Amino acid sequence: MQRGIVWVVDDDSSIRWVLERALAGAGLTCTTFENGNEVLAALASKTPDVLLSDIRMPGMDGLALLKQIKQRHPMLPVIIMTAHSDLDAAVSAYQQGAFDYLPKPFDIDEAVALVERAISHYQE
């Protein structure tokens, strides 16, 4: 009848709180994690219609390696998050670790509306 989920992982200060508030109000069913580690192993199990990824820690991270990212989410939208340099996310996050990206302190609509395009990105 109705489907659509939004996942978000961060630990800034209270973004995922506003992100999950704009993401949930853009589809349905939304969640929020800390680093998004467990989410990884929880991505190859459930896997919503989309997910975020803002951090910079090993073991998981967005682009990180490149393999685990595959299975975990080969086509699934996992966007990304991280300013400064990111020549790796400017490639691996362009056709692998998410085709989307949320660099700099984007906005809500600009963030949510960015997820709405990643969701439909699935349907040719």
Method: NMR
- DSSP one-letter string for the chain: -----EE-B--SSSHHHHHHHHHGGGSS-B--BSSSHHHHHTTTTT--SEE--B---TTS-SSSSSHHHHHHSSSS----B--S--TTTTTTTTTTS-S----SS--SHHHHHHHHHHHGGG--
Please give the backbone phi and psi of residue 65, each rounded to the nearest 5 degrees, phi first.
-45, -90
| Spatial separation of the C-alpha atoms in residues 111 and 18, rounded to whole Å | 10
Q: In this structure, are strands 50-51 and 6-7 parallel, antiparallel, or unpaired? A: parallel
The answer for residues whose C-beta is within 8 angstroms of residue 85's C-beta and 6 or more apart is none
**Domains of the chain and CATH, by start:** 1-124 (3.40.50.2300)
